[PDB]
Amino acid sequence: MKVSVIGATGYTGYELVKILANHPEFEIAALVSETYADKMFSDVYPRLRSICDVVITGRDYDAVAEISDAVFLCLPHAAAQDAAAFFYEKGLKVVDFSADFRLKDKKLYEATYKVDHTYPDLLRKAVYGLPEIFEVDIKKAELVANPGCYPTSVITPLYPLLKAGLISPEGIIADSKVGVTVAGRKADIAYSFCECNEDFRPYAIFSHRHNPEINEVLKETGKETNVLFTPHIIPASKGIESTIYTKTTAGLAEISACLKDFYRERRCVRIYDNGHIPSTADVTDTNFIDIGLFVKGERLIIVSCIDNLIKGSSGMAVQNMNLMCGFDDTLGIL
Amino acid sequence: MKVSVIGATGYTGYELVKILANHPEFEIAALVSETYADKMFSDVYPRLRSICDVVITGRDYDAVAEISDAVFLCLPHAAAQDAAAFFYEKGLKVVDFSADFRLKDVDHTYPDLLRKAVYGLPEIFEVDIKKAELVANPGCYPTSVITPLYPLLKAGLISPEGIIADSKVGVTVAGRKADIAYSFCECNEDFRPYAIFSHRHNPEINEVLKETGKETNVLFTPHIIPASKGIESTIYTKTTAGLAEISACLKDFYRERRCVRIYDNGHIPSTADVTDTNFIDIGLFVKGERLIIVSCIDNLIKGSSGMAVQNMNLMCGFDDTLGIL
Ligand code: NA
Ligand code: NA
Ligand code: NA
């Protein structure tokens, strides 16, 4: 099966190509980048020399659609909508890395971006690609909205606890931290080495687009949540750690059993209830999500770690494409 | 004036010696590091070659008392108690870096001395520090949390309940220790929480905040940054007041304290803004009934050695920012 990557020279595209080169079913057709067209992919990433030397092509979406059965969209806001619309109408399967199709409520989209959605009819066909929760919907999908990296680390541990009513839906605080790769492959001074090295900073206080995504997805548990989310930048390349504060009516063993029962068949989910504390190094360069549970009285603290570029992006995207194409979601990953 | 440093070769003593070398009134008499005795301080830290070449001496506390008017104790627990008792009985001013004398409330060896100890947060308890002989230096984490919270609780502009402090520190928090958990290869590119529900600084924060008359139950969770220095504390509180009144309460309380830099305009402090300085940067953000405070310090300076020089300045009748600003 032929797949193409639009915006292939970014960091999410690099991590995607690494997985795709070893995937037993997906064959790389085209890698699209206007900046690096006509260059080999290994010219941009010499680490992949002799592993993936595919010549990068420009944004000729017509030629891409003729040689591809499915497409990964590693494109920024708005540009992702245009590409998703084009390749969807050509009959291809589409995984969109952007946030543009994650909020199915148009009024919530407009509340977040202050503008209308450009393809509202296409929006109603998008499925939220959190593979360990919405697998049934994803298998029936043609357009998948790849979840955000932060929401992946927060929704995954919270969803089964709220569904079973073991924690309060009110007052949840998610204090999350990410490596600099969250910005993507950018030349801006804000993401230069000398500005980011040795620096740790919060950002997007009261205003990050992932906050509405988190609360809108947790609605599906039947509980209305008002999760407060605050992101931070780590002076490291990759990794997310989310320290999540909740109120609980259950103890450590009951909370642990709820999470381990819900994800019993999911080999990418590693849950700890023995005092082990996950860190970003435990999940960097893997597709795992590590969840640590800690209970004192009526307070539950969850530590949730992922590689933002893999389980938070490209690895989760391969899981979604696997599900849409009838394969096991972990095929080519584990 | 003559001052000495006990346990001077740690990172806190390193930052302390940097300040003392350029201090107009404090004159270094002895730098005590027992594992490094008979080496020059610049042998351990070559950056200070030609700046502080003082020969490190051993554990001769009688000799230190002979030549010193005051002493900084950068010692671990228990050892800090004995040294603090010795130099107090000899009539010296003492700033203890450890936690042995912070909490006025496994029994304390010197309980009568504990009652004389003053909690050395210079911008809050300056009145009591000017009259003290023994000052307990606050911890680095509590300094970043207590400073923005104390005026708001005292004015009743935030709720004392449900406060959450999610704090992050560079690896220098561990000190100059031989330990695999603090090696470069184990800490590089890694970010981790630790001491969940169990860090010793959590009780310190709540005990000091009681002085406002409000009973707090701050929940504090620390994290290790893959960087050398800096603390960032994201503090979550509930409030019914506006940003203007929260901002005005903090700026009025710290009006003449030049090391406190308070922002209310959307500026977000970061650890790079305060690293290698004695400043504490505080950013204020209000949406509805939620106040988010961003508090940053250098954990080795404003969180430790710089704050200690403020406390020693105050005890010695000097301006608290002397030798710092
Ligand atoms: Na680093
Ligand atoms: Na782990
Ligand atoms: Na900054």
Residue numbers in the entry:
A (entry chain A): 1 to 334
B (entry chain B): 1 to 105, 115 to 334
Text taken from the publication that reported this structure:
Here, we seek to establish the direct reduction of formyl phosphate into formaldehyde through developing a new-to-nature enzyme, formyl phosphate reductase (FPR). We identify promiscuous FPR activity in four enzyme families and present one homolog of N-acetyl-γ-glutamyl phosphate (NAGP) reductase from Denitrovibrio acetiphilus (DaArgC) that produces relevant levels of formaldehyde. The ArgC active site can be divided into three parts, the NADPH-binding domain, the catalytic site, and a substrate-binding channel.
Using a semi-rational enzyme engineering approach, we create a triple substitution variant of the enzyme (DaArgC3) that shows a complete loss of the native enzyme activity (i.e., NAGP reduction), a 300-fold shift in specificity towards formyl phosphate, and a decreased side reactivity with acetyl phosphate. Across all substrate concentrations, DaArgC3 showed a fourfold improved formaldehyde productivity over wild-type (WT) DaArgC in vivo. Variants DaArgC1, DaArgC2 and DaArgC3 showed similar turnover numbers (0.1–0.2 s−1), but were already saturated at apparent Km (formyl phosphate) values around 20-30 mM, indicating that they performed better at formyl phosphate concentrations that are physiologically more relevant in vivo. The apparent Km for NADH (~0.3 mM) was approximately sixfold higher compared to NADPH, while the specific activities were at about 50% of the activity with NADPH (~0.1 s−1), indicating that variants DaArgC1-C3 had evolved to also accept NADH as redox cofactor, which they could additionally access in vivo besides NADPH. When we re-established the glycine residue at position 182 in DaArgC2 and DaArgC3 (creating variants DaArgC2* and DaArgC3*), NADPH selectivity of the variants was fully restored, indicating that the glycine to valine substitution was responsible for the observed cofactor flexibility. Solving the crystal structure of DaArgC3 suggested that the position of residues T9, S33, E34 and T35 (numbering according to mtArgC29) that interact with the 2′ phosphate of NADPH was not significantly affected by the G182V mutation. However, we noted that G182 lies within the conserved GAG motif of the substrate-binding channel (residues 182–184) and is flanked by two amino acids, T181 and R185, that form hydrogen bonds to the nicotinamide group and the diphosphate of NADPH, respectively.
